[PDB]
Design a protein around this ligand. Sequence first.
Ligand SMILES: O=C(O)CNC(=O)C(=O)O
Ligand SMILES: [Mg+2]
Ligand code: NI
Ligand SMILES: [Zn+2]
Length: 331
Amino acid sequence: AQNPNCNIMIFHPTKEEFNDFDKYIAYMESQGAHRAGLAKIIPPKEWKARETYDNISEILIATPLQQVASGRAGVFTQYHKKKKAMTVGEYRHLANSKKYQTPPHQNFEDLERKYWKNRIYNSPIYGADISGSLFDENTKQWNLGHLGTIQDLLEKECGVVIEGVNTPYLYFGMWKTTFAWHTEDMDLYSINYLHLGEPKTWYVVPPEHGQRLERLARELFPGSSRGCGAFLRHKVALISPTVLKENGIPFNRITQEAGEFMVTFPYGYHAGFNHGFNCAEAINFATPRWIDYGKMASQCSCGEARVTFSMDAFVRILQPERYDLWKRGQD
Ligand SMILES: O=C(O)CNC(=O)C(=O)O
Ligand SMILES: [Mg+2]
Ligand code: NI
Ligand SMILES: [Zn+2]
């Protein structure tokens, strides 16, 4: 069995190996990459996502989200308070202001210590979940707006044609902006490209151990757990590496830098934080190996998780028994 300790693997494809996206995912899996839940892919030196980032300031962040924490430093939830619209140029200036800017630090490990010590005492503002793309149309390799769609994959594997679309999303971050512990909708893959700016630190639980994280979360967030049998779908709970180690939960960590891709694998729980002003692009995707995970994915039916139009068909076809309850949660 490849990668039996579930370490995060880093790949360096050549320009030739970067042509065929599906083939390279399947290659990484042949080497055991999925066992970690997360892999890093460093593009060949010949590749670029676009020519420059000099002309992005007029993109609008219609609903910036202020991430307000409650709890203790290593075990907290966050809620998202909506703020007035602002442009990317306005948000960048805000991120760089004395109130929000990255503090002085020695290295990534010092900054990580400062994040976990101090995150809860601040409320950073995240420009998340913005439909759009920064890949040039002429970039043919690993262009996250030109991937095979999940609806086409389901149709190729199972024969059923379904409605829905699959487009990318932009994330504009600042110091301390936070992504809570989650797996993807329907336990899909994700791919994330860090276009510019400061790093993103990731934490991940191997898919084979995901239920250990879920059991810890029910213990640490007992009110939330009574409210919903899949409350990590709400994407609000944070647990620090120190607390995970104290409770024996297997996990790994890695820092993504500008110009690098990260892939999350089906049922790989992940969480993390941004180091300073940055912009990432991400999208969900599927492969044949996903289908079995989609059929078994938990679902939130309490009303909180509310998701895209395109998840309807995935529930309806892969999980018909659960469909009626889940759709009630959507309505
Ligand atoms: O970058 C973020 O805020 C969160 N991204 C992801 O969870 C992802 O790409 O799967
Ligand atoms: Mg612009
Ligand atoms: Ni994710
Ligand atoms: Zn719920």
